[PDB]
UniProtKB/Swiss-Prot annotation:
This is Ras-related C3 botulinum toxin substrate 1. Keywords: Cell membrane, Cell projection, Cytoplasm, Disease variant, Glycoprotein, GTP-binding, Hydrolase, Intellectual disability, Isopeptide bond, Lipoprotein, Membrane, Methylation, Nucleotide-binding, Nucleus, Palmitate, Phosphoprotein, Prenylation, Synapse, Ubl conjugation. The effector region mediates interaction with DEF6. GO terms for molecular function: enzyme binding; G protein activity; GTP binding; GTP-dependent protein binding; GTPase activity; protein kinase binding; protein-containing complex binding; Rho GDP-dissociation inhibitor binding. It catalyses: GTP + H2O = GDP + phosphate + H(+). The modification (Microbial infection) O-AMP-tyrosine is found at Y34. Regulated by guanine nucleotide exchange factors (GEFs) which promote the exchange of bound GDP for free GTP, GTPase activating proteins (GAPs) which increase the GTP hydrolysis activity, and GDP dissociation inhibitors which inhibit the dissociation of the nucleotide from the GTPase. GTP hydrolysis is stimulated by ARHGAP30. Changing G32V: No interaction with PPP5C. Translocates to the plasma membrane; also. NCBIfam families: small_GTP (TIGR00231). Changing W58A: Strongly reduced interaction with PLCB2. Changing T19N: Constitutively inactivated. Abolishes interaction with PARD6 proteins. No effect on NR3C2 transcriptional activity. No interaction with PPP5C. Doesn't activate PPP5C phosphatase activity and translocate PPP5C to the plasma membrane.
Amino acid sequence: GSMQAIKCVVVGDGAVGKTCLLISYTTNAFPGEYIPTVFDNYSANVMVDGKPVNLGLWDTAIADVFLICFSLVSPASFENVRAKWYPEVRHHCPNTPIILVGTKLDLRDDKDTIEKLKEKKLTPITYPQGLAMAKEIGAVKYLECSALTQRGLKTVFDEAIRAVLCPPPV
Ligand SMILES: Nc1nc2c(ncn2[C@@H]2O[C@H](COP(=O)(O)OP(=O)(O)O)[C@@H](O)[C@H]2O)c(=O)[nH]1
Ligand SMILES: [Mg+2]
């Protein structure tokens, strides 16, 4: 083998968890240490639907697929999905698939994160809201994950890969 190379570019507001997402997926450990500007890309060889793939993951601060990320406990990062990130991706690339990724899923039911938001008059983003935002930006998929617990983490990348190996008919 022979593997297919796929380039995936990850974008989203500062502090939404892009770097921790990529490290947690590729090394299988959530980082408890500082991660320099040194590393701006990560890699993983993965089997998806019986196919060996080299997934190249670019951490931003000729993509085959974009991940646009917002934190499930930051309404401001969610609004920027449509106000900033969707337009910036589409200017450069009109057709490349976008996956919309809600991060920090472990906090969406967290009592103290819920309270903290509540005292600024805010609330976590819900699954239906996220799904509606994916439709609004024409994302091929909406996924939620925690880098910390790894809940939903593999699916993000499997679906980024499927987006490339299996484009829609129309
Ligand atoms: N609770 C929780 N915290 C997270 C998760 N992912 C990242 N964080 C935290 O969010 C903050 C920013 O993460 P980072 O990956 O540096 O965000 P970036 O600026 O988008 O690269 C850090 O303090 C991380 O520890 C997560 O899945 N759950
Ligand atoms: Mg980062």
